[PDB]
Design a binder for these strands. Structure first.
Lengths: 217, 213, 218, 212
RNA sequence: AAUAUUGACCUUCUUUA
RNA sequence: UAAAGAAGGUCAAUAUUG
């Protein structure tokens, strides 16, 4: 019954610097009986469930690091991180529990890091998939920064755009770097009708493309 | 010591119903409230309701009335959440959360993914990835063509947790595909057994593919 | 927890005409579940306890005349009387009973009526008070209109200003007229030292003053 | 036939306490709630609190928390309110009123006048007021009493029409009241007219016949 | 011990069928 | 009799403290 508003939607800082995020409630969440602010902060890392960080606006739950600190009262509240670690990458929701239970929009925290060149590796089709009649060439690009990256497949020097499946990860919990996987799937017949297979990667850390190829032989 | 173990994933046909569970332990079951929270893919959180196991008292969100039904079982200290007449907008992850009476959320469960679709299950095909024919070596494991989500992946039963990258599943041609990579030192391969563990609970599949030279 | 405010603290109308009074609440008294206004009107005639007139803003309680009608919703409400009777002289409070119980300031209603001449009567002391040693001369002036009236006591033609006690009534429930009592108190010794005692009243219904006197043993 | 009969008025010394009763009849005493209301002389109304006689639950106004205590007795359908540590501001009329659970005020009692003062009691001195055609007036004088209220009736209530009772007036630290009644010259002196006075504080009652 | 809160049961009141 | 809402009481528990 009380609307929460988190601002900004996204934030990026370097590791080891301070951050501040805001939660604004339509009505006041300060109860007059106990003189407490019915506000709580929760963290949600990629692939995990929410975790309680702060309750009563400023009280830190047991087990939580000392980097997180809550502040505010009435309708304006703030969550602060004194020193951001790579693991702090997550979305943080503010929550009121005075009149029913309503959540905020959430705030995403990004970690700024130095440049990092991608490490490329190619893998030919497995004898298992071949006996089944298919051929997939996988191309891994791990631990690079920034996230902007472009991949290109070539068969015998000719660019191919069809039959490609790409997937990207979020910033690592230890390195704050990105990784990408690219897979090109063909039939066993067509796979054996060509000799060369190539991965062409475009990244900011190099003017010329990063190339990784293998030839049937 | 407080732990909340939720049931596994579920695939439901449109219009049908489903019932999941949240088994509690590490505290007095009847002394605390059990909330339930929804989270659509790529979206935020939302409250549904809660139960008071002592008297089985209910308190629902106005929008989920008639959609969700909460019950409890003190004999097994387990709370249940039933959803009726499922539709496309009901595909999401559902958490169970403990509080007080009522208080605030303080302990969460791992969640239970729900897929509402008429498509039927399909088990994946696992394939090992090794170099063709420096100081490090990277191996991979391809999980191609399965429905529905999710799928678990663990290298060397979990003993290998450093230097691993698991990529999110991508939908294509009405099937999901996943991949994963792991990097080790040149001395560690092929002088040590590296094997890929894959489990698709929907199809009751469990495969262990070793990476060969 | 909700403040009520009535606009007309005092208002006067002629007998047989309609009347309207306002009650304004700070917050809304309309409940959304049952769609009812938690407002009530009460009447208090001089010397009596309050009486329930209307509830739910417009619902008329049983036994009350049909002249009273309630209206309004939300925060502005009105009590109306189609034709004012002499008995309607009273104070009317509006009441909210949604968030705690709070009352309004009240509204006093006066009845306008035609002129009426006072009926004066004088009374010598009683043999009981005399045996005790005192003497009180009472002068009753009943059923007159308008209320503006001045009374003065005279002993053997000389005006006396000390030892006088006056009391007034409100408009009658049947006549809508006023009445007044005036008492002059002396000792028996001083009382027996004079012959004539008079109360003289000045009212609009007569150009010359109204005189009423008596003589000791005449 | 719902009827609420409250107890008589009380004169209390400063700092002392007092308790009054409201006897109910004509309905199920337990099913309905009994409110109490205060009305200072010449001012408006004020809610104090209410009680649920079934299980004796109470809800008080914040302003009367430590001042009033509400109890009940279901065997006799009687409500009670006790006031503690009375000051001058507590001098007022106190009503009892019935509602629902809680609903609104529907029936009211006649009220109980409470006077807080250390001044002693003084009973009145009643005097008949007799005259010296077609219409005769007679009066009755209640002089020098304390505190309020006083009760005055004509022929034990048999005479109600044409009566004018005047409000009391304070003078020389005492109150005084008077009342008049007009009848037909055929009704007096043949038919006996009598004045009946009562002063609760002094526990006195007098009947003074109007004689020619 | 006090205040406040959620739920269940019970009595009763209120708006409706 | 049934639905919804409200007041009080009892019971279990939670929160704020002293």
């Amino acid at each position: 019954n009380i609307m929460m508003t988190q601002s900004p939607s996204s934030l990026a800082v370097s590791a080891g610097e301070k951050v501040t995020m805001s939660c604004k409630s339509s009505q006041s969440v300060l109860y007059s009986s106990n003189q407490k602010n019915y506000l709580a902060w929760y963290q949600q890392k990629p692939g995990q469930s929410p975790k309680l960080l702060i309750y009563w606006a400023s009280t830190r739950e047991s087990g939580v690091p000392d980097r997180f600190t809550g502040s505010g009262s009435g309708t304006d509240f703030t969550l602060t991180i004194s020193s951001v670690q790579a693991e702090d990458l997550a979305v943080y929701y503010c929550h009121q529990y005075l009149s029913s239970y309503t959540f905020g929009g959430g705030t995403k925290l990004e970690i700024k890091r130095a440049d990092a060149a991608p490490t490329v590796s190619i893998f030919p089709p497995s004898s298992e998939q071949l006996t089944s009649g298919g051929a997939s060439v996988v191309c891994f690009l791990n631990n690079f920064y920034p996230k902007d990256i472009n991949v290109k497949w070539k068969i015998d020097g000719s660019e191919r755009q069809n039959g490609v499946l790409n997937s990207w990860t979020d910033q690592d919990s230890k390195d704050s770097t990105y990784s990408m996987s690219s897979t090109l799937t063909l039939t066993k017949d067509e796979y054996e009708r060509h000799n060369s297979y190539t991965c062409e990667a475009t990244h900011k850390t190099s003017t010329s493309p990063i190339v990784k190829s293998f030839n049937r032989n | 010591e407080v732990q909340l173990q939720q049931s596994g994933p579920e695939l439901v046909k449109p219009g049908a119903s489903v019932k999941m569970s949240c088994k509690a332990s590490g505290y007095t079951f009847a002394n605390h409230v059990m909330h339930w929270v929804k989270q659509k893919p790529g979206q935020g959180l939302e409250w549904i309701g809660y139960i008071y196991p002592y008297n089985d008292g209910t308190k629902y969100n106005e929008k989920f009335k008639g959609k969700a039904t909460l019950t409890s079982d003190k004999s097994s200290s387990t709370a249940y959440m039933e959803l009726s007449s499922l539709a496309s907008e009901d595909s999401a992850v559902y958490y169970c959360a403990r509080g007080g009476n009522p208080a605030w959320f303080a302990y969460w469960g791992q969640g239970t993914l729900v897929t509402v679709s008429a498509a039927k299950t399909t088990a994946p095909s696992v394939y090992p990835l090794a170099p063709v024919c420096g100081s490090s070596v990277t191996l991979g494991c391809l999980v191609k063509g399965y429905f529905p989500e999710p799928v678990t992946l663990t290298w060397n039963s979990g003993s290998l947790s450093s230097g691993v990258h698991t990529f999110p599943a991508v939908l294509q041609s009405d099937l999901y595909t996943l991949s994963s990579s792991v990097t080790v030192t040149s001395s560690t391969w092929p002088s040590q057994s590296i094997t890929c563990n894959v489990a698709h609970p929907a199809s009751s599949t469990k495969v262990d593919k070793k990476i060969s030279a």
